[PDB]
Design an enzyme around this catalytic site. Structure first.
Site, PDB file in Angstrom:
ATOM      1  CG  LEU A  49     -18.773   5.239  -6.956  1.00  0.00           C
ATOM      2  CD1 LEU A  49     -17.339   4.959  -7.388  1.00  0.00           C
ATOM      3  CD2 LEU A  49     -18.938   6.666  -6.442  1.00  0.00           C
ATOM      4  CG  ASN A  73     -15.765  -2.690  17.635  1.00  0.00           C
ATOM      5  OD1 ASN A  73     -15.130  -1.725  17.158  1.00  0.00           O
ATOM      6  ND2 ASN A  73     -16.659  -2.543  18.610  1.00  0.00           N
ATOM      7  CG  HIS A 108     -21.008  -1.488  26.734  1.00  0.00           C
ATOM      8  ND1 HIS A 108     -21.706  -2.114  25.723  1.00  0.00           N
ATOM      9  CD2 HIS A 108     -20.082  -0.714  26.123  1.00  0.00           C
ATOM     10  CE1 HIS A 108     -21.237  -1.722  24.551  1.00  0.00           C
ATOM     11  NE2 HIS A 108     -20.253  -0.865  24.765  1.00  0.00           N
ATOM     12  CB  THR A 158     -15.360   1.636  19.319  1.00  0.00           C
ATOM     13  OG1 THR A 158     -16.349   1.518  20.343  1.00  0.00           O
ATOM     14  CG2 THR A 158     -14.307   2.645  19.801  1.00  0.00           C
ATOM     15  CG  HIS A 160     -22.466   1.220  20.938  1.00  0.00           C
ATOM     16  ND1 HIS A 160     -21.466   0.885  20.055  1.00  0.00           N
ATOM     17  CD2 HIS A 160     -21.934   1.104  22.173  1.00  0.00           C
ATOM     18  CE1 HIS A 160     -20.365   0.606  20.727  1.00  0.00           C
ATOM     19  NE2 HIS A 160     -20.619   0.742  22.013  1.00  0.00           N
TER      20      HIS A 160
HETATM   21  C1  LIG Z   1     -15.684   7.468  -0.747  1.00  0.00           C
HETATM   22  O1  LIG Z   1     -14.380   7.993  -0.945  1.00  0.00           O
HETATM   23  C2  LIG Z   1     -13.407   7.093  -1.462  1.00  0.00           C
HETATM   24  C3  LIG Z   1     -12.009   7.754  -1.486  1.00  0.00           C
HETATM   25  O2  LIG Z   1     -11.961   8.767  -2.470  1.00  0.00           O
HETATM   26  C4  LIG Z   1     -13.798   6.554  -2.841  1.00  0.00           C
HETATM   27  O3  LIG Z   1     -12.951   5.454  -3.136  1.00  0.00           O
HETATM   28  C5  LIG Z   1     -12.083   5.560  -4.269  1.00  0.00           C
HETATM   29  O4  LIG Z   1     -12.779   5.244  -5.459  1.00  0.00           O
HETATM   30  C6  LIG Z   1     -12.054   5.008  -6.660  1.00  0.00           C
HETATM   31  C7  LIG Z   1     -13.013   4.306  -7.634  1.00  0.00           C
HETATM   32  O5  LIG Z   1     -13.556   3.116  -7.068  1.00  0.00           O
HETATM   33  C8  LIG Z   1     -10.762   4.176  -6.493  1.00  0.00           C
HETATM   34  O6  LIG Z   1      -9.933   4.332  -7.644  1.00  0.00           O
HETATM   35  C9  LIG Z   1      -9.323   3.070  -8.050  1.00  0.00           C
HETATM   36  O7  LIG Z   1      -8.004   2.933  -7.548  1.00  0.00           O
HETATM   37  C10 LIG Z   1      -7.410   1.658  -7.739  1.00  0.00           C
HETATM   38  C11 LIG Z   1      -6.066   1.625  -7.008  1.00  0.00           C
HETATM   39  O8  LIG Z   1      -6.218   2.308  -5.779  1.00  0.00           O
HETATM   40  C12 LIG Z   1      -5.172   2.017  -4.818  1.00  0.00           C
HETATM   41  O9  LIG Z   1      -4.513   3.193  -4.368  1.00  0.00           O
HETATM   42  C13 LIG Z   1      -5.335   4.095  -3.629  1.00  0.00           C
HETATM   43  C14 LIG Z   1      -4.627   5.441  -3.420  1.00  0.00           C
HETATM   44  O10 LIG Z   1      -3.562   5.358  -2.495  1.00  0.00           O
HETATM   45  C15 LIG Z   1      -5.767   3.409  -2.327  1.00  0.00           C
HETATM   46  O11 LIG Z   1      -6.564   4.251  -1.517  1.00  0.00           O
HETATM   47  C16 LIG Z   1      -6.521   2.113  -2.641  1.00  0.00           C
HETATM   48  O12 LIG Z   1      -6.854   1.509  -1.397  1.00  0.00           O
HETATM   49  C17 LIG Z   1      -7.937   0.549  -1.455  1.00  0.00           C
HETATM   50  O13 LIG Z   1      -7.455  -0.784  -1.472  1.00  0.00           O
HETATM   51  C18 LIG Z   1      -6.599  -1.076  -0.365  1.00  0.00           C
HETATM   52  C19 LIG Z   1      -6.004  -2.468  -0.536  1.00  0.00           C
HETATM   53  O14 LIG Z   1      -7.016  -3.365  -0.929  1.00  0.00           O
HETATM   54  C20 LIG Z   1      -7.339  -0.912   0.979  1.00  0.00           C
HETATM   55  O15 LIG Z   1      -6.449  -0.976   2.077  1.00  0.00           O
HETATM   56  C21 LIG Z   1      -8.121   0.408   1.051  1.00  0.00           C
HETATM   57  O16 LIG Z   1      -9.010   0.346   2.150  1.00  0.00           O
HETATM   58  C22 LIG Z   1      -8.885   0.698  -0.251  1.00  0.00           C
HETATM   59  O17 LIG Z   1      -9.939  -0.252  -0.326  1.00  0.00           O
HETATM   60  C23 LIG Z   1     -11.209   0.228  -0.835  1.00  0.00           C
HETATM   61  O18 LIG Z   1     -11.187   0.607  -2.218  1.00  0.00           O
HETATM   62  C24 LIG Z   1     -11.006  -0.450  -3.172  1.00  0.00           C
HETATM   63  C25 LIG Z   1     -10.921   0.119  -4.591  1.00  0.00           C
HETATM   64  O19 LIG Z   1      -9.607   0.586  -4.830  1.00  0.00           O
HETATM   65  C26 LIG Z   1     -12.104  -1.516  -3.020  1.00  0.00           C
HETATM   66  O20 LIG Z   1     -11.867  -2.625  -3.858  1.00  0.00           O
HETATM   67  C27 LIG Z   1     -12.180  -2.012  -1.572  1.00  0.00           C
HETATM   68  O21 LIG Z   1     -13.303  -2.839  -1.418  1.00  0.00           O
HETATM   69  C28 LIG Z   1     -12.257  -0.868  -0.552  1.00  0.00           C
HETATM   70  O22 LIG Z   1     -13.574  -0.359  -0.541  1.00  0.00           O
HETATM   71  C29 LIG Z   1      -5.691   1.230  -3.599  1.00  0.00           C
HETATM   72  O23 LIG Z   1      -4.584   0.666  -2.922  1.00  0.00           O
HETATM   73  C30 LIG Z   1      -7.265   1.370  -9.239  1.00  0.00           C
HETATM   74  O24 LIG Z   1      -6.838   0.032  -9.397  1.00  0.00           O
HETATM   75  C31 LIG Z   1      -8.561   1.620 -10.041  1.00  0.00           C
HETATM   76  O25 LIG Z   1      -8.249   1.700 -11.432  1.00  0.00           O
HETATM   77  C32 LIG Z   1      -9.002   0.791 -12.297  1.00  0.00           C
HETATM   78  O26 LIG Z   1     -10.146   1.395 -12.901  1.00  0.00           O
HETATM   79  C33 LIG Z   1      -9.802   2.573 -13.638  1.00  0.00           C
HETATM   80  C34 LIG Z   1     -11.031   3.404 -14.023  1.00  0.00           C
HETATM   81  O27 LIG Z   1     -10.671   4.772 -14.014  1.00  0.00           O
HETATM   82  C35 LIG Z   1      -8.926   2.236 -14.858  1.00  0.00           C
HETATM   83  O28 LIG Z   1      -8.341   3.424 -15.367  1.00  0.00           O
HETATM   84  C36 LIG Z   1      -7.806   1.230 -14.549  1.00  0.00           C
HETATM   85  O29 LIG Z   1      -7.525   0.542 -15.753  1.00  0.00           O
HETATM   86  C37 LIG Z   1      -8.097   0.218 -13.415  1.00  0.00           C
HETATM   87  O30 LIG Z   1      -8.662  -0.955 -13.985  1.00  0.00           O
HETATM   88  C38 LIG Z   1      -7.903  -2.143 -13.653  1.00  0.00           C
HETATM   89  O31 LIG Z   1      -8.441  -2.840 -12.536  1.00  0.00           O
HETATM   90  C39 LIG Z   1      -9.784  -3.289 -12.717  1.00  0.00           C
HETATM   91  C40 LIG Z   1     -10.347  -3.812 -11.393  1.00  0.00           C
HETATM   92  O32 LIG Z   1      -9.390  -4.617 -10.734  1.00  0.00           O
HETATM   93  C41 LIG Z   1      -9.847  -4.320 -13.855  1.00  0.00           C
HETATM   94  O33 LIG Z   1     -11.183  -4.659 -14.164  1.00  0.00           O
HETATM   95  C42 LIG Z   1      -9.185  -3.767 -15.128  1.00  0.00           C
HETATM   96  O34 LIG Z   1      -9.128  -4.781 -16.114  1.00  0.00           O
HETATM   97  C43 LIG Z   1      -7.815  -3.109 -14.846  1.00  0.00           C
HETATM   98  O35 LIG Z   1      -6.813  -4.079 -14.589  1.00  0.00           O
HETATM   99  C44 LIG Z   1      -9.321   2.887  -9.578  1.00  0.00           C
HETATM  100  O36 LIG Z   1      -8.785   4.043 -10.189  1.00  0.00           O
HETATM  101  C45 LIG Z   1     -10.015   4.516  -5.190  1.00  0.00           C
HETATM  102  O37 LIG Z   1      -8.991   3.578  -4.949  1.00  0.00           O
HETATM  103  C46 LIG Z   1     -10.968   4.545  -3.994  1.00  0.00           C
HETATM  104  N1  LIG Z   1     -10.262   4.886  -2.761  1.00  0.00           N
HETATM  105  C47 LIG Z   1     -10.515   4.401  -1.526  1.00  0.00           C
HETATM  106  C48 LIG Z   1      -9.652   4.907  -0.397  1.00  0.00           C
HETATM  107  O38 LIG Z   1     -11.389   3.572  -1.269  1.00  0.00           O
HETATM  108  C49 LIG Z   1     -15.234   6.047  -2.767  1.00  0.00           C
HETATM  109  O39 LIG Z   1     -15.677   5.740  -4.073  1.00  0.00           O
HETATM  110  C50 LIG Z   1     -16.181   7.055  -2.111  1.00  0.00           C
HETATM  111  N2  LIG Z   1     -17.485   6.469  -1.967  1.00  0.00           N
HETATM  112  C51 LIG Z   1     -18.555   7.109  -2.437  1.00  0.00           C
HETATM  113  C52 LIG Z   1     -19.862   6.394  -2.254  1.00  0.00           C
HETATM  114  O40 LIG Z   1     -18.494   8.215  -2.996  1.00  0.00           O
HETATM  115 CA   LIG Z   2     -17.164   3.312  20.898  1.00  0.00          CA
HETATM  116 CA   LIG Z   3     -21.539   1.146  -9.564  1.00  0.00          CA
HETATM  117 CL   LIG Z   4     -18.724  -5.701  14.328  1.00  0.00          CL
HETATM  118 ZN   LIG Z   5     -19.222   0.329  23.486  1.00  0.00          ZN
END
Ligand SMILES: *[C@@H]1O[C@H](CO)[C@@H](O[C@@H]2O[C@H](CO)[C@@H](O[C@@H]3O[C@H](CO[C@H]4O[C@H](CO)[C@@H](O)[C@H](O[C@H]5O[C@H](CO)[C@@H](O)[C@H](O)[C@@H]5O[C@H]5O[C@H](CO)[C@@H](O)[C@H](O)[C@@H]5O)[C@@H]4O)[C@@H](O)[C@H](O[C@H]4O[C@H](CO)[C@@H](O)[C@H](O)[C@@H]4O[C@H]4O[C@H](CO)[C@@H](O)[C@H](O)[C@@H]4O)[C@@H]3O)[C@H](O)[C@H]2NC(C)=O)[C@H](O)[C@H]1NC(C)=O
Ligand SMILES: [Ca+2]
Ligand SMILES: [Ca+2]
Ligand SMILES: [Cl-]
Ligand SMILES: [Zn+2]
Ligand SMILES: O=C(c1cnc(OCC(F)(F)F)c(C2CC2)c1)N1C[C@@H]2[C@H](C1)[C@H]1CN(C(=O)c3ccc4[nH]nnc4c3)C[C@@H]21
Ligand code: NA
Ligand code: NA
Length: 806
Positions: free
Chosen positions: A689, A180, A265, A159, A420
């Protein structure tokens, strides 16, 4: 603390929240133990029920009534939804013939058609047809609006992950609501259904529609409702919000029904007790539409009728117990049910070993009803790995089954008959979509699509720019009459080189040999043309894929196939070839069994070598264009070029060989020729990616030959199968896969049998959208067709699922 001593007088279902310790009067105060003392009295009136009766018409307004039949009710915006029907001789909306809504017909002051998202929990796709007699309102929406036969939920088909995916366009792995129920090791906190922790904002990633709307100046009704607020009251509250002055009135609303999930359910998807909940939901829709018609909004508002997932038959006797497999069952924590997720019970236990846990769960019983995976080995189409809340060890549970830790858990924690959560390809998990309104098409059926696509469309419906998400914007344009979003093709980042013959055979020292020294301006002019791309219009049907990142690569032409050869990864990024219906399977001749030939267009330094494969005891090799499908004995020599070669475990060569020798031909026969694009995928951090070169964790020993985590193929033909794949005048037909490149076949419990009993089952499990391959390779396919770009985007999001008909 909440000083619940304030009053809700004039504040009932207020749109902005108030911060403690001021008491609240919004639709979520119940859930926060925070309503003002007088909320129930002022805001949750029930007196006289929900409908006007013949003797309430023209009545003196009495404020205690749940809704009014007084003369001033339309101006006050608070008539019972059936007022005009009973008292002003009007008909119900469901009794009116539908008439096309060519343009929005809204009252003055409405800047945009409002959007109402009507979400129904557990609404199985097949209910549309099977319940059709008891859902007249819903059936009118469905047949008069735009509908899909079903919509694909995201995995797990639970859900919160699905509702929050609807709200954000994101995979759960990206939005963070991966079940969930969750443990986050960084926060050291748990998220549960019951409790206050789920209210903490830190769980909720991305940007849900209400926030997107708010930031771009579109006002949003508060989406959620405390469970105790009855459906009729939610409806009256939305309709009231819709009478607010222009400057105060929201443009986007949400309604949520706990039904039919709740009953499903208890009674199973098709229990006879299910008819009533379906009648009731229909009645709620009836009320909405009657109330819209009352306010002259029934040809102004866009309505979305959308479910989160289906429901399957599941009883307690269909439970698999981890205690029948593990000796150490107390050292683990299991998230149980329709999926399994396992972690160590204690971080201070260094004797805990995931490898031995998996092995103890692998193919242990004949009809075993789950399959263990390391999360990065789950089919890429589930996109379920890249989050710290998803446990390394996952169990994919067969439809109709549960997994639990110990029998004690089931009988001390049969009651239920429905559940589900299973794989999102499963038919019983499919759910519904209907759009109805001026912005949706009239009496239009569209093909199944995934719920990740809706965020974009809801943004389009409201004139909003979507936050970055997992939809493919434009792929659902064919649902819309107007407001379409007209995307352009991404620009190619790297252009290819076109190398000619540049190296002499003796410059190569690769330890490869071939018996090719068996030797005519008739057939020499011919082969020159072939290497310059004479047959390229045959094997490259949709143009070459564009490389969307900075890299160095070469186009290589051959009689039978064309490749984009990466000088960085030492293998093609893609290999494209066409197999016509008439094509002939041949074997690799005996003399050529181990043949590998240097490619005189590519330098030794950008080539693989046979020695590294010899020295690497674990790793063998395969070819992207299969030698079996060579068009002539002489053409076959091309297939043995070191530039067509890719690293493969012997275990995976079993899968690959069978695909190339048996399955490509079979598909060519059945589909009237097929175009195939095949290649390697590197996803070592399992983020969905393309890996950069510094992310590769494994090379063929002694070399810089990187090892793929997966191999893909994209198989295209003509949708009209009376036309050959290479002469197609209209829409295309596609299926694809992303096969994991594994050193064993433990995934397939039948793998010691002939390839014809397990390989295809595995390929089907690992079916994929072309768009999944795009993310994983940084390539952009179908660049040059005669089709519109929107139609191509739909094609790229297509998933061939292999489920029977719904
Ligand atoms: C599906 O769609 C989504 C959305 O578009 C795609 O996800 C995006 O992919 C991007 C690449 O992975 C990623 O960009 C990175 O952003 C980092 C900072 O981002 C923050 O801000 C954004 C914007 O507001 C926010 O959305 C982020 O939120 C994530 O994290 C919070 C807190 O943890 C969570 O609440 C939230 O759910 C979300 O989590 C998810 O994403 C993160 C990745 O950010 C995962 O780790 C989680 O597991 C989870 O899935 C953030 O708050 C930024 O830090 C990155 O920059 C690094 O790399 C670039 C390369 O260009 C470089 O320039 C920089 O130097 C930097 O490197 C530094 O950090 C490295 C790693 O720590 C380190 O090795 C180096 O030495 C450096 O210090 C990067 O630009 C973007 O954030 C996500 N967005 C979301 C919403 O997930 C997704 O890919 C798509 N999927 C497919 C299959 O297509
Ligand atoms: Ca449901
Ligand atoms: Ca990869
Ligand atoms: Cl679950
Ligand atoms: Zn249900
Ligand atoms: O209030 C919203 C909401 C309603 N609409 C929402 O979004 C509508 C939109 F997507 F259209 F935007 C969202 C969003 C996820 C936040 C949430 N709710 C209230 C209920 C349900 C959704 C959640 C799940 N709960 C359960 O008890 C539950 C229900 C069915 C189950 N089957 N098996 N186990 C189950 C456990 C508690 C919460
Ligand atoms: Na080897
Ligand atoms: Na096996």
């Amino acid at each position: 603390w909440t000083a619940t001593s304030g009053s809700c007088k004039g504040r009932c279902f207020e749109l902005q929240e108030v911060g403690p310790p001021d008491c609240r009067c919004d639709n979520l105060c119940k859930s926060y133990s925070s309503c003002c003392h007088d909320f129930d009295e002022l805001c949750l009136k029930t007196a006289r029920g929900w409908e006007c009766t013949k003797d309430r018409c023209g009545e003196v307004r009495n404020e205690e009534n749940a809704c009014h039949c007084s003369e001033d009710c339309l101006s006050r915006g608070d008539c019972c939804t059936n007022y005009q029907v009973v008292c002003k001789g009007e008909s119900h909306w469901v009794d009116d013939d539908c008439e096309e809504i060519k343009v929005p017909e809204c009252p003055a002051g409405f800047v945009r058609p409002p959007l109402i998202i009507f979400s129904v929990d557990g609404f199985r796709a097949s209910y549309m047809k099977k319940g059709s007699k008891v859902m007249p309102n819903i059936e009118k929406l469905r047949s008069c609006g735009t509908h899909a036969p079903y919509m694909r939920p995201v995995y797990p088909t639970k859900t919160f992950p699905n509702l929050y995916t609807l709200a954000t366009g994101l995979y759960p792995e990206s939005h963070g609501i991966v079940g969930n129920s969750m443990y986050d090791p960084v926060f050291d906190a748990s998220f549960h259904l019951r409790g206050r922790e789920k209210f903490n904002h830190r769980w909720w990633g991305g940007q849900p529609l209400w926030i997107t709307a708010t930031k771009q100046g579109v006002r949003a009704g508060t989406f959620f409702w405390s469970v105790s607020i009855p459906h009729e009251r939610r409806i009256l509250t939305i309709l009231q919000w819709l009478s607010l002055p222009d400057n105060e009135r929201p443009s986007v609303y949400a309604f949520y029904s706990e039904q039919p999930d709740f009953s499903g359910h208890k009674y199973g998807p098709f229990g006879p007790e299910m008819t009533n909940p379906l009648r009731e939901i229909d009645k709620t829709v009836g009320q909405l539409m009657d109330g819209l018609k009352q306010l002259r909004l029934h040809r102004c508002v866009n309505v979305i009728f959308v479910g989160d997932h289906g429901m399957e038959d599941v009883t307690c006797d269909r439970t698999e117990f981890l205690s029948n497999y593990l000796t150490n069952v107390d050292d683990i924590t299991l998230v149980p049910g329709t999926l399994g997720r396992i972690r160590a019970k204690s971080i201070n236990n260094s004797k805990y070993d995931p490898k031995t846990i998996i092995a103890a769960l692998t193919c242990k019983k004949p009809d075993q009803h789950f399959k263990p995976y390391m999360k990065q080995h789950l089919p890429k189409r589930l996109h379920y790995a890249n989050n710290r809340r998803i446990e390394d060890i996952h169990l994919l549970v067969d439809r109709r089954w549960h997994v639990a830790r110990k029998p004690l858990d089931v009988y001390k924690k049969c009651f239920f008959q429905g559940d589900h959560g299973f794989d999102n390809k499963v038919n019983s998990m499919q759910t519904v979509f209907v759009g109805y309104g001026p912005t949706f098409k009239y009496r239009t059926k569209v093909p199944p699509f995934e719920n990740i696509e809706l965020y974009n469309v809801m943004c389009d419906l409201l004139g909003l720019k979507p936050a970055p998400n997992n939809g493919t914007h434009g792929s659902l344009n064919h649902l819309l009459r107007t407001n379409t979003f007209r995307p352009t093709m991404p620009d190619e980042v790297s252009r290819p080189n076109y190398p000619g013959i540049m190296y002499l055979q003796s410059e190569f020292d690769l330890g490869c040999t071939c018996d090719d020294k068996v030797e005519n301006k008739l057939e020499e002019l011919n082969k020159r043309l072939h290497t310059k791309g004479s047959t390229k219009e045959r094997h490259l049907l949709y143009g070459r894929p564009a490389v969307l990142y900075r890299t160095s690569y070469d186009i290589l032409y051959h009689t039978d196939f064309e490749s984009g050869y990466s000088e960085i990864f030492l293998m093609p990024l893609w290999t494209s070839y066409t197999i016509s219906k008439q094509a002939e399977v041949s074997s690799i001749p005996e003399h050529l069994t181990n043949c590998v030939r240097p490619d005189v267009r590519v330098s030794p330094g950008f080539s693989q070598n046979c020695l590294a494969y010899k020295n690497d005891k674990q790793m063998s090799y395969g070819f992207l264009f299969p030698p079996y499908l060579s068009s002539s004995p002489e053409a076959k020599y091309d297939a043995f070029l070191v530039t067509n070669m890719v690293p493969m475990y012997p275990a995976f060569k079993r899968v690959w060989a069978y695909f190339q020798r048996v399955l490509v031909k079979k598909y060519a026969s059945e589909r009237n020729g097929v175009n195939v694009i095949s290649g390697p995928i590197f996803d070592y951090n399992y983020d969905g990616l393309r890996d950069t070169e510094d992310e590769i964790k494994q090379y063929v020993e002694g070399s810089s030959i990187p090892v793929p985590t997966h191999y893909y193929s994209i198989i295209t033909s003509c949708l009209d199968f009376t036309q050959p794949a290479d002469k197609c005048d209209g829409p295309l037909s596609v299926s694809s896969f992303i096969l994991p490149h594994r050193p064993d076949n433990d995934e397939s419990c039948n793998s010691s049998e002939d390839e014809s009993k397990w390989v295809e089952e595995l390929m089907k499990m690992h079916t994929a959208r072309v768009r999944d391959i795009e993310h994983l390779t940084g390539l952009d396919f179908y660049r040059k067709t005669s089709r519109s770009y929107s139609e191509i985007l739909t094609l790229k999001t297509y998933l061939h699922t292999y489920e029977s008909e719904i």
